[PDB]
Design a protein around this ligand. Structure first.
Ligand code: PC
Ligand code: PC
Ligand code: PC
Ligand code: PC
Ligand code: PC
Ligand code: PC
Ligand code: PC
Ligand code: PC
Lengths: 88, 88, 88, 88
């Protein structure tokens, strides 16, 4: 099945596939981990979440604001809160 | 005679042939072990139980979900409860 | 694809899935290993080969001859030569 | 500009963005590195090359064969020769 982001595993919140406790990226099929997980294929990795809030401002695309080198995007609607992100 | 699954032997519940107390896999001929048993041949091993509950969801076939290597199935109607399984 | 039995891997001949160099049973998809392999599902394990030669005699079913406890079968047409077998 | 795959840098052939000589993945803008390069964004990474030769066989799609974890594809027409790949 599909990955559920974010998911909580051992009290740790994940907004993307993780190598936490693994040799290969995996994701939970449930927000609250109950034993269902799978290794991640390219399509399974978390995609940019638009729009997202950063510094109290709304972003509709990848941005260099707050980075100034490589554009990035949030992996949740509110980066200020979750701080989950990835380079684009 | 025929294996009875699950069977209880020395405080352990077995849903398949076991090496519990032996070198070669065996099974009890009674739900509650009372001295009747036999060594398991290929046909004696437990078969998949469908459907089965896993991660609070109903599965009608084997699944690769939750396994680091191969598709598997529960050996009881409720894997979450019994945790008994085999690869497919 | 399908397993090829027997297959040679690092000069070792295998007539069934093996854990040789692995944490889980696997098989080569080519008689002469060239990098193609897969983990084995139940259907992939080597099945009895009938008829098979043992002690210069032909066997059409699993036999206890030469064992006298649990019936077994060869995993190749000529056990005398290959010595590959499994309990039935 | 755009990545050129494969590209040669300091005696190494790269069929995808690389961390060779850096902390962040990059790629040469020329087959033979001559000073033109850029850091890779998601879109810059090499894409699967179909069909590709693997184990002397022709593959038209990604395959789980040969991988301990995930389906993959070659980054060149001949994996046996180049050994360049990526997960799918
Ligand atoms: C980390 N993992 C989810 C890939 C495997 C271990 O899972 P679990 O044994 O904590 O349920
Ligand atoms: C997400 N980021 C680290 C790339 C840039 C924003 O950084 P910060 O202002 O939240 O520290
Ligand atoms: C002896 N042993 C502890 C390894 C296994 C079987 O013990 P028991 O619980 O059946 O008495
Ligand atoms: C534990 N399980 C029944 C969910 C799956 C089998 O686990 P694994 O040992 O193949 O990774
Ligand atoms: C043993 N194995 C085939 C599962 C993996 C290692 O394969 P290889 O690296 O010798 O080609
Ligand atoms: C195959 N076997 C070991 C079960 C019985 C035959 O043994 P052997 O006569 O080849 O030694
Ligand atoms: C320095 N290093 C050996 C770790 C990696 C890069 O070396 P080089 O071959 O590019 O000169
Ligand atoms: C090496 N390969 C390209 C055949 C497959 C990937 O290997 P693995 O590291 O996922 O097991």
């Amino acid at each position: 099945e599909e990955c559920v982001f974010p998911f909580v595993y051992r009290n740790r919140k994940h907004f993307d596939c993780t190598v936490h406790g693994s040799l290969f990226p995996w994701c939970s099929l449930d927000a609250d981990y109950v034993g269902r997980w799978k290794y991640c294929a390219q399509r399974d990795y978390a995609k940019c979440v638009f729009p997202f809030i950063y510094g109290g401002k709304k972003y509709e695309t990848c941005t260099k604001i707050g980075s100034m080198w490589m554009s990035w995007c949030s992996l949740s609607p509110n980066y200020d809160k979750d701080r989950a992100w990835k380079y684009c």
